[PDB]
Amino acid sequence: SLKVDGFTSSIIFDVIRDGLNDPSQAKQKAESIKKANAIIVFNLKNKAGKTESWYLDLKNDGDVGKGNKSPKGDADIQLTLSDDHFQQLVEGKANAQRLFMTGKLKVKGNVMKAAAIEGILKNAQNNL
Amino acid sequence: SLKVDGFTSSIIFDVIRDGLNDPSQAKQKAESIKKANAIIVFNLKNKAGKTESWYLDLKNDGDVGKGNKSPKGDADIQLTLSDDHFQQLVEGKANAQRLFMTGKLKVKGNVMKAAAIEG
Ligand SMILES: CCCCCCCCCCCCCCCC(=O)O
């Protein structure tokens, strides 16, 4: 339901939302917001030339939703890459730093904080 | 055998074990472990209200067994579904993303591993 047709990686946002919002993740969620203190927007591009965005609010209460903007504020970080590369990145087939360095991943806002997000997200979302 | 009475789909665990362990599939088994690097637990539910779990260890040696934990470590990802839908899924009669969108399939654990295993 955060999934959008024509973006095959987007199903991942539902899985991330369920993991992060799981009330058993309350502590992890709070620690992640403390660490990240950031609203991160993902702008995905597909081959048909479409753009779709999702937000990850690790700054206020912890939320994942559809849109290029949290309802509780503007993005601190914007990450722009293709559907394909986002898939690869979530799988671990591509490294975010290599994608950045080869022009596949564009970042607006702090690149150091951007790098840290991967590990901070991993911890908050992982509800097993 | 890994299958359990009242779980019609559970024969797939015996099937997966034999197919994975077939000496002819040594290269494939190795690649799957290399690629997945994950312990997957299946929690199945039936119409009688019962729950049974199996694990598929694609991180260590490639074992399939009964229970909600591998002996050689904790689960990275957990899939919960009904006996009925799991059978459909295994027989290529239902799609995993569709089951997940309609709430028939519940996923817990590492999003990276979840992504990696689906393929
Ligand atoms: C390798 C598996 C990753 C699983 C976690 C999914 C979250 C993906 C978001 C990654 C954010 C990192 C962006 C790095 C930006 C940079 O420093 O170039």
Ligand SMILES: CCCCCCCCCCCCCCCC(=O)O
């Ligand atoms: C016929 C092969 C099936 C036997 C092996 C069982 C594995 C089937 C389950 C597929 C994994 C589903 C992961 C999708 C979760 C998601 O990211 O939405």
